[model samples]
Target chain A: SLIWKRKITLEALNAMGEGNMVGFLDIRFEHIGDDTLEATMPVDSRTKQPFGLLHGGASVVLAESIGSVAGYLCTEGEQKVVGLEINANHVRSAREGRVRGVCKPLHLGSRHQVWQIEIFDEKGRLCCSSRLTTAILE
Target chain B: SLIWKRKITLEALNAMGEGNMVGFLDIRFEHIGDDTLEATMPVDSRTKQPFGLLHGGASVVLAESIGSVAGYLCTEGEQKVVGLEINANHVRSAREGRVRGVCKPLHLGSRHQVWQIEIFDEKGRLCCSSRLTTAILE
Candidate 1:
């Protein structure tokens, strides 16, 4: 079991993304489980690619946003989380509705953390799976 | 020199992204070289992360966008490109101004293509480096 070093709320998480791509993509944080974080983004013009399918990059943004927030929650006071690297594989395509992203920590170390995020389409089929590596700065 | 199976222009490339993340992020096609394609994105509120720096995910989006177009540019008639996997490393941070992404193909095959995209800040500092693998559909 993972313990969050800091208290967090959906409001704070959503607020953190208010003025950036997270907000522009309309990604909304929905849940904070014992060891997971969940968010959703709609598959529409804002997130579609040239082919009218959900853009792989938009999925990456959603995955990274949730993973980044999850990594931040595990840090103590005065510490920050910065993305070092991220990899995502798009498995399925989505053309409408919303996609849910669930993030779970793979590794949380003193200097770095790795989080895995899986995105599913409205029908609960996997759309993308991503891994984010973050550098923890004190 | 890598030969393009399909002739491309700045207008066509930019138009391809008109209604999606590329347009939403305001990524503009800048140039087409003998072996490379370039585009730029501003590091404003729309692309920034919570820390007020250019979001790593935004960098990924830019990288993926340029690479995706480059992959499509290499295909012949009746062929389309879809991203299979993408990976990015955020090397430096950008606070303002525009960052440019240059994409070059790593491998172009009958069914798959790999592209490398490097993003640079206004001063030509490397901000992020990414690779995208695309599957060609007929």
Candidate 2:
């Protein structure tokens, strides 16, 4: 079992002022737990391709951000974590709607943490699914 | 069996212009089959994160591009193909090196085509593995 050090707030994250693209894109923190974090983003023309559908890149960014942040939090400030791996499967395209991602911690080893993230369109259709692994740095 | 006629060459892709990031890094046509294609890319600082490790977004771009192009070829110019699903798993990280992705056709059905892409680092270590599903627009 791990002890919770302190709750991380979005305001605190914003104050870091690191040019985080995810934050700039308005990725909102929806939920947090001991080992998981959830985030969501709205699909807009900015995230669209010439074809006018959601760009695959946008989906990837959303997945990676949520997973990475969740893994980082799971470390509980004991170690710094960097994304080791990330995979996103796009299932559908949304032109004008929101995409929600729910990240769940899979494994929290001493040296690594893994998280599974599922993204869905506004209609609740699965749009993309991703798994992210992070290596802990002490 | 379906016939896909849309063929995108490196020059043709280059004409599409640069991406928001990565700036048209590298694309090489490895091979082509009845309904498949493969490609590779090198890992560089631009493709890394603040931690100087390969970014998951880079892997996603490589996988989606290769698989989508392969799916387009599988349709034989008969149907427009769009990415329906993609999932990637990162197994390793490289601070400086190259990675190759070999995309193989797994299923070529009337409704969709599935491609499995395996990405390996310079040392032939599996860095990222991905599966992509494309929906055939009839």
- Which regions of candidate 2 deviate over 4 angstroms? A1-7, A11-36, A40-50, A80-91, A96-100, A105-114, A120-126, A129-138, B1-4, B17-46, B96-100, B121-125
TM-score for the B chain of model 1: 0.96
Best by TM-score: 1
Off by over 4 Å in 1: none
What lDDT score belongs to each candidate, Candidate 1 first? Answer: 0.91, 0.68
- Model 1 Cα interface RMS deviation (Å): 1.0
Residues forming the 10-long window of minimal summed lDDT in candidate 1 chain A: A1-10
**Docking class for candidate 1:** high
- Best model per lDDT: 1
Q: Give the range of the ten consecutive residues with the poorest summed lDDT in model 1 chain B.
A: B2-11
Q: Please, what are the lDDT tens digits per residue for candidate 2 over residues A1-138?
A: 442345679666443323335544556777665555667787764455445566786688778877776666666556777776666666667777778888877787889877788888888888887787788888
Best by DockQ: 1
